[PDB]
Design an enzyme around this catalytic site. Structure first.
Site, PDB file in Angstrom:
ATOM      1  N   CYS A 135       0.609  -1.065  -0.413  1.00  0.00           N
ATOM      2  CA  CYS A 135      -0.018   0.038   0.215  1.00  0.00           C
ATOM      3  C   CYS A 135       0.566   0.881  -0.169  1.00  0.00           C
ATOM      4  CB  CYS A 135      -1.104  -0.513   1.106  1.00  0.00           C
ATOM      5  SG  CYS A 135      -2.050   1.834   0.963  1.00  0.00           S
ATOM      6  N   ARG A 147       0.278   4.469   2.815  1.00  0.00           N
ATOM      7  CA  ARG A 147       0.120   4.087   4.167  1.00  0.00           C
ATOM      8  C   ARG A 147       0.980   5.773   5.153  1.00  0.00           C
ATOM      9  NH1 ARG A 147       4.269  -1.041   4.580  1.00  0.00           N
ATOM     10  NH2 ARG A 147       4.760   0.008   2.627  1.00  0.00           N
ATOM     11  N   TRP A 190      -8.963   6.773  -0.905  1.00  0.00           N
ATOM     12  CA  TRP A 190      -9.315   7.847  -1.986  1.00  0.00           C
ATOM     13  C   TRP A 190      -8.364   6.916  -2.949  1.00  0.00           C
ATOM     14  CZ3 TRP A 190      -8.228  10.680   2.340  1.00  0.00           C
ATOM     15  CH2 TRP A 190      -6.549  10.715   2.679  1.00  0.00           C
ATOM     16  N   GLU A 192      -4.870   4.045 -10.502  1.00  0.00           N
ATOM     17  CA  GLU A 192      -6.055   2.940 -10.172  1.00  0.00           C
ATOM     18  C   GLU A 192      -6.884   3.840 -10.728  1.00  0.00           C
ATOM     19  OE1 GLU A 192      -6.221   1.864  -5.766  1.00  0.00           O
ATOM     20  OE2 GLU A 192      -6.440   3.829  -5.486  1.00  0.00           O
TER      21      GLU A 192
HETATM   22  C1  HEM Z   1      -5.876   6.978   1.917  1.00  0.00           C
HETATM   23  C2  HEM Z   1      -5.809   6.317   0.621  1.00  0.00           C
HETATM   24  C3  HEM Z   1      -4.920   4.993   0.133  1.00  0.00           C
HETATM   25  C4  HEM Z   1      -4.631   5.111  -1.147  1.00  0.00           C
HETATM   26  C5  HEM Z   1      -4.269   6.083  -2.004  1.00  0.00           C
HETATM   27  C6  HEM Z   1      -4.500   3.737  -1.322  1.00  0.00           C
HETATM   28  C7  HEM Z   1      -3.647   3.115  -2.413  1.00  0.00           C
HETATM   29  C8  HEM Z   1      -3.218   2.112  -3.270  1.00  0.00           C
HETATM   30  C9  HEM Z   1      -2.545   1.148  -3.666  1.00  0.00           C
HETATM   31  C10 HEM Z   1      -2.240   1.730  -5.428  1.00  0.00           C
HETATM   32  C11 HEM Z   1      -2.518   0.347  -3.911  1.00  0.00           C
HETATM   33  C12 HEM Z   1      -2.234  -1.080  -4.551  1.00  0.00           C
HETATM   34  C13 HEM Z   1      -3.664  -1.965  -5.744  1.00  0.00           C
HETATM   35  C14 HEM Z   1      -3.225  -1.805  -7.192  1.00  0.00           C
HETATM   36  O1  HEM Z   1      -2.677  -0.864  -7.224  1.00  0.00           O
HETATM   37  O2  HEM Z   1      -4.020  -2.439  -7.278  1.00  0.00           O
HETATM   38  C15 HEM Z   1      -2.881  -0.353  -2.168  1.00  0.00           C
HETATM   39  C16 HEM Z   1      -2.766  -1.483  -1.854  1.00  0.00           C
HETATM   40  C17 HEM Z   1      -3.383  -1.997  -0.797  1.00  0.00           C
HETATM   41  N1  HEM Z   1      -4.042  -1.057   0.352  1.00  0.00           N
HETATM   42 FE1  HEM Z   1      -4.044   0.921   0.531  1.00  0.00          FE
HETATM   43  N2  HEM Z   1      -4.429   2.951   0.000  1.00  0.00           N
HETATM   44  C18 HEM Z   1      -5.490   3.706   0.843  1.00  0.00           C
HETATM   45  C19 HEM Z   1      -6.371   3.532   1.165  1.00  0.00           C
HETATM   46  C20 HEM Z   1      -6.244   2.069   2.447  1.00  0.00           C
HETATM   47  C21 HEM Z   1      -6.464   1.605   3.630  1.00  0.00           C
HETATM   48  C22 HEM Z   1      -7.231   2.709   4.511  1.00  0.00           C
HETATM   49  C23 HEM Z   1      -6.409   0.308   3.582  1.00  0.00           C
HETATM   50  C24 HEM Z   1      -7.118  -0.225   4.532  1.00  0.00           C
HETATM   51  C25 HEM Z   1      -7.490   0.574   6.421  1.00  0.00           C
HETATM   52  C26 HEM Z   1      -5.618  -0.176   2.258  1.00  0.00           C
HETATM   53  C27 HEM Z   1      -5.569  -1.581   3.037  1.00  0.00           C
HETATM   54  C28 HEM Z   1      -4.142  -1.983   1.217  1.00  0.00           C
HETATM   55  C29 HEM Z   1      -3.961  -2.732   1.081  1.00  0.00           C
HETATM   56  C30 HEM Z   1      -4.276  -4.093   2.344  1.00  0.00           C
HETATM   57  C31 HEM Z   1      -3.118  -2.964   0.204  1.00  0.00           C
HETATM   58  C32 HEM Z   1      -2.674  -4.630  -0.833  1.00  0.00           C
HETATM   59  C33 HEM Z   1      -3.386  -5.476  -0.761  1.00  0.00           C
HETATM   60  C34 HEM Z   1      -3.086  -6.840  -0.868  1.00  0.00           C
HETATM   61  O3  HEM Z   1      -1.671  -7.001  -0.685  1.00  0.00           O
HETATM   62  O4  HEM Z   1      -3.536  -7.548  -2.191  1.00  0.00           O
HETATM   63  N3  HEM Z   1      -5.553   0.918   2.184  1.00  0.00           N
HETATM   64  N4  HEM Z   1      -3.032   0.718  -1.694  1.00  0.00           N
HETATM   65  C1  OU4 Z   2      -8.559   1.091   0.871  1.00  0.00           C
HETATM   66  C2  OU4 Z   2      -8.099   1.326  -0.536  1.00  0.00           C
HETATM   67  C3  OU4 Z   2      -7.367   2.392  -1.452  1.00  0.00           C
HETATM   68  C4  OU4 Z   2      -7.141   2.689  -2.685  1.00  0.00           C
HETATM   69  N1  OU4 Z   2      -6.680   3.757  -3.074  1.00  0.00           N
HETATM   70  N2  OU4 Z   2      -7.263   1.502  -3.640  1.00  0.00           N
HETATM   71  C5  OU4 Z   2      -7.088   0.110  -3.114  1.00  0.00           C
HETATM   72  C6  OU4 Z   2      -6.594  -1.024  -3.163  1.00  0.00           C
HETATM   73  C7  OU4 Z   2      -6.457  -2.142  -2.520  1.00  0.00           C
HETATM   74  C8  OU4 Z   2      -5.955  -3.077  -3.503  1.00  0.00           C
HETATM   75  C9  OU4 Z   2      -5.593  -4.480  -2.418  1.00  0.00           C
HETATM   76  C10 OU4 Z   2      -4.823  -5.604  -3.791  1.00  0.00           C
HETATM   77  C11 OU4 Z   2      -5.437  -5.880  -4.521  1.00  0.00           C
HETATM   78  O1  OU4 Z   2      -5.692  -6.800  -5.841  1.00  0.00           O
HETATM   79  C12 OU4 Z   2      -6.237  -7.261  -5.303  1.00  0.00           C
HETATM   80  C13 OU4 Z   2      -5.689  -8.945  -6.715  1.00  0.00           C
HETATM   81  C14 OU4 Z   2      -6.711  -9.423  -8.142  1.00  0.00           C
HETATM   82  O2  OU4 Z   2      -5.669 -10.504  -8.655  1.00  0.00           O
HETATM   83  C15 OU4 Z   2      -4.809 -10.827  -7.586  1.00  0.00           C
HETATM   84  N3  OU4 Z   2      -4.872 -10.163  -6.343  1.00  0.00           N
HETATM   85  C16 OU4 Z   2      -6.538  -4.765  -5.478  1.00  0.00           C
HETATM   86  C17 OU4 Z   2      -7.059  -4.358  -6.956  1.00  0.00           C
HETATM   87  N4  OU4 Z   2      -8.446  -4.407  -6.973  1.00  0.00           N
HETATM   88  C18 OU4 Z   2      -6.781  -3.240  -4.610  1.00  0.00           C
HETATM   89  C19 OU4 Z   2      -6.925  -2.466  -2.185  1.00  0.00           C
HETATM   90  C20 OU4 Z   2      -7.479  -1.023  -0.544  1.00  0.00           C
HETATM   91  C21 OU4 Z   2      -7.345   0.562  -0.976  1.00  0.00           C
END
Ligand code: HEM
Ligand code: OU4
Ligand code: HEM
Ligand code: OU4
Ligand code: H4B
Ligand code: H4B
Ligand code: ZN
Lengths: 411, 411
Positions: A108, A111, A280, A285
């Site tokens: 993430c 964070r 947000w 994304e």
């Molecule tokens: C507040 C603004 C936040 C932004 C801009 C943000 C951004 C991102 C982005 C860009 C990713 C990559 C996922 C992708 O691109 O497919 C990600 C992953 C993730 N976010 Fe954040 N996030 C935010 C808040 C949060 C919150 C509030 C939580 C949980 C309370 C969270 C938990 C996670 C987790 C657990 C992952 C990775 C999941 C995995 O291991 O597959 N995020 N986030």
């Molecule tokens: C709170 C929050 C904000 C944000 N701005 N972004 C987020 C993006 C993710 C997140 C995490 C893992 C992901 O990947 C899952 C997966 C797909 O296939 C194998 N794993 C994806 C893809 N939607 C999103 C989770 C939370 C988010």
């Protein structure tokens, strides 16, 4: 034993001691790296050491390690486990746990915000209708008329795995996808399989390009039930471009609130299988992944056509050029409607500052470079040149199989 | 243990058995992934050397379908005796060429490995002097350039003996632009080369102190002091950089050289160590445009490009950096293609590499690959390697990093 990471653009070197506190495995070995692999029932036997470890962490964070409140709580949890085979977190522990699960989320980039998480305790919930009401309130609070606020809602923990709470939607707000008989897809291809479950459960699909999916909610292991989020609670942003007046005519929109609802929250060995969390969007994304992935809306071609690009040979970089414009439009549309969004230059810069501060005051910051680096313009963001260590800390958010593959149907 | 990798854009799943042959170590553990660390990592005793050679000769004779044959066992015996006596051994020319081609084939960080078996190998193991080294390198440069129709080549100088007689090319590449710091602020020329550009002057070089000064060669033979040599300018093919739409682009006064020829790595075959082994191919466009022009600690000309495009450089959210990045990379491809100098764009190379992966999984059972390095530094997710899971592991023969010689050499 210390480990060093180097930012090759600034020569800043940081030292990680926190990785020693890691317990879980990565999937890697000394002879193979699985860093790019997407994805690499619990008894009293292994639960008290997990509880003790979480409680030690909890009372260290409040400067009460070894206090009487600490030893008493350990005892109380101890007896509650041998007696009831599980245990209940205090409210203070639940909030600490949810914040640290985010703080530990190595993939993430957002964070920096981890300590400002609004935690909604939904552990008294008993039914799918109660789930729908908790989720409506989460959506209203987090959306905040465009001024988005991070929130998590936590439903009852797993007990015997036969009474799970689950949100069957991968996110709370997502657009339907319909596979057509000619092989084309109407709407979001990423959601075709879930859309079909909904229809099969009796959802009346409008069959438009941006239909908001119903909530499919499962309480206490029962069959899931359908509910429609009040449309007034779903904030949406029409996508237009600041220079290209034809961009609006593509008819695109996107929802404001990213709220991920299919992950599992692990706190002190307890498993919270339904725990939607929201923040947000980072602009990429939506603009890179949601619209331009070949397996998504794939508007790359039409944008390139309307821009009159050399689409003949790929070495004209028409794909790159359309991608940048689509992302300009996403950022512009959200900012114009005053819906919270962050671009990928801002978000990666903040993360570097976060990461350095975490190395200073915590001894490390686990980070998954493969996921932290934005999906466009990678090397012109400061994380690209940043070395990172990836390890698994608890409390954690984990993956879990989609419930339709594991659910035993009631009927 | 017969690991699998999935492409998430196509669901194609490959099964990797090749990794089970992996010898060396990755730097990861079960508790920590170091997949984004730039550089993990004196004579070889008589005992360590024979197993390394047996392993290598085993795969060589397998590759020619003569495993367990007369010729195999005899060669095994012959090399065994040579090590026993001489404390090292020499490769047959056939083994030299095979070893070099497979060091490229095994370069898990290289996206251009579909070309791996078309390597021109130049055996320079009879070289004894820096002048002779210079002769071999001019011949390499002229052969590889081929009037713009670039051809892959490696030139292999004598193998290390006791670490006192190392052959070394001190340049990081055969052809690189000079970098001089300024008395006022930043840097003129190329900032990556500032220390080396000094060790040239500090060694005797007469710097023309321009922006695109081809650096001199600094060649070290048999462990002696290195010697300065100027590459004949008519062997250094350069491309003036212009844009197919922006006539003010030429005013920037930009050019790059056609030949990427990396000269600081160590080639390891069957335990033998070739410390001087310059190898060359042709550029992927982004290696000049994204990295060599737009990295903050490089040419960093993003500022003026966006300025001359009259872009809104006030907020990062306009994505002006992204827009300029695309244009600079369109120009590089355009200029190279216009001048009939070989170049590949990041879409073509990554598509080619997926095809190569499929070929390697089919006829070899795997392909070590480092996603952190295979994904281009721009438009990552719209290239096919982004959604491709990869397994990184170290196979031998290999190219390895080695310390910079001036940090080692007793002068
Ligand atoms: C507040 C603004 C936040 C932004 C801009 C943000 C951004 C991102 C982005 C860009 C990713 C990559 C996922 C992708 O691109 O497919 C990600 C992953 C993730 N976010 Fe954040 N996030 C935010 C808040 C949060 C919150 C509030 C939580 C949980 C309370 C969270 C938990 C996670 C987790 C657990 C992952 C990775 C999941 C995995 O291991 O597959 N995020 N986030
Ligand atoms: C709170 C929050 C904000 C944000 N701005 N972004 C987020 C993006 C993710 C997140 C995490 C893992 C992901 O990947 C899952 C997966 C797909 O296939 C194998 N794993 C994806 C893809 N939607 C999103 C989770 C939370 C988010
Ligand atoms: C012919 C066209 C080739 C192309 C387009 C190409 C492309 C690339 C690229 C983009 C990288 C990433 C490095 C960076 O971003 O700075 C790389 C790394 C590398 N290439 Fe290739 N390459 C080619 C030929 C070759 C040849 C002929 C060899 C050896 C004989 C080779 C060996 C390597 C090695 C050893 C590395 C990485 C070293 C490490 O492990 O850090 N390449 N290549
Ligand atoms: C034949 C060839 C062609 C090409 N088209 N491209 C190449 C790029 C590299 C290469 C290898 C390692 C690198 O990184 C090593 C490193 C130096 O300092 C810290 N790490 C770099 C980046 N210079 C490039 C090597 C060979 C290449
Ligand atoms: C910190 C990070 O590991 C480092 O910047 C790497 C990342 N990936 C890269 N990938 C390529 N192709 N080339 C590079 O120089 C780098 N640099
Ligand atoms: C195979 C590869 O690991 C996979 O496509 C990952 C790569 N990195 C990613 N990075 C982000 N931010 N989001 C993603 O979905 C992915 N997907
Ligand atoms: Zn790893």
């Amino acid at each position: 034993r210390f480990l060093k990471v180097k930012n090759w653009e600034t020569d800043v070197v940081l030292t990680d001691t926190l990785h020693l506190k890691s317990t879980l495995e990565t999937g890697c070995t000394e002879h193979i790296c699985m860093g790019s692999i997407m994805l690499p029932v619990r008894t009293k036997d292994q639960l008290f050491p997990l509880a003790k470890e979480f409680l030690d962490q909890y009372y260290s964070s409040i400067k009460r390690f070894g206090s009487k409140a600490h030893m008493d709580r350990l005892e109380e949890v101890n007896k509650e486990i041998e007696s009831t085979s599980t245990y209940q977190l205090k409210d203070t522990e639940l909030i600490y746990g949810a914040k640290h699960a985010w703080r530990n989320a190595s993939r993430c980039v957002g964070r920096i915000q981890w300590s400002k998480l609004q935690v909604f305790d939904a552990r008294d919930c008993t039914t799918a209708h109660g789930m729908f009401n908790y989720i409506c309130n989460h959506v209203k609070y987090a959306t905040n008329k465009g001024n988005l606020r991070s929130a998590i809602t936590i439903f009852p923990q797993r007990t015997d795995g036969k009474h799970d709470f689950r949100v069957w939607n991968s996110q709370l707000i997502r657009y339907a996808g319909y596979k057509q008989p000619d092989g084309s897809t109407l709407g979001d291809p990423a959601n075709v399989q879930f859309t079909e479950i909904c229809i099969q459960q009796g959802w009346k699909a409008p069959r438009g390009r941006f239909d908001v999916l119903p909530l499919l909610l499962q309480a206490n292991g029962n069959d899931p039930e359908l509910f429609q989020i009040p449309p007034e609670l779903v904030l949406e942003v029409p996508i237009r471009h600041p220079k290209f007046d034809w961009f609006k005519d593509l008819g695109l929109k996107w929802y404001g609130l990213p709220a991920v609802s299919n992950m599992l929250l692990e706190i002190g060995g307890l498993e919270f299988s339904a725990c939607p969390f929201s923040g947000w969007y980072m602009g990429t994304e939506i603009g890179v992944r949601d619209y331009c992935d070949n397996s998504r809306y794939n508007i790359l071609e039409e944008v390139a056509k309307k821009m009159d690009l050399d689409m003949r040979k790929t070495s004209s970089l028409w794909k790159d050029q359309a991608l940048v414009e689509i992302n300009i439009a996403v950022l512009y549309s959200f900012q114009s409607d005053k819906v919270t969004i962050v671009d990928h230059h801002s978000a990666t810069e903040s993360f570097i500052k976060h990461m350095e501060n975490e190395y200073r005051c915590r001894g490390g910051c686990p980070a998954d470079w493969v996921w932290i680096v934005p999906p466009m313009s990678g090397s012109i963001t400061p994380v690209f040149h940043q070395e990172m260590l990836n390890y698994r800390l608890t409390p954690s958010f984990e993956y879990q199989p989609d419930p339709w593959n594991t659910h035993v149907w009631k009927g």
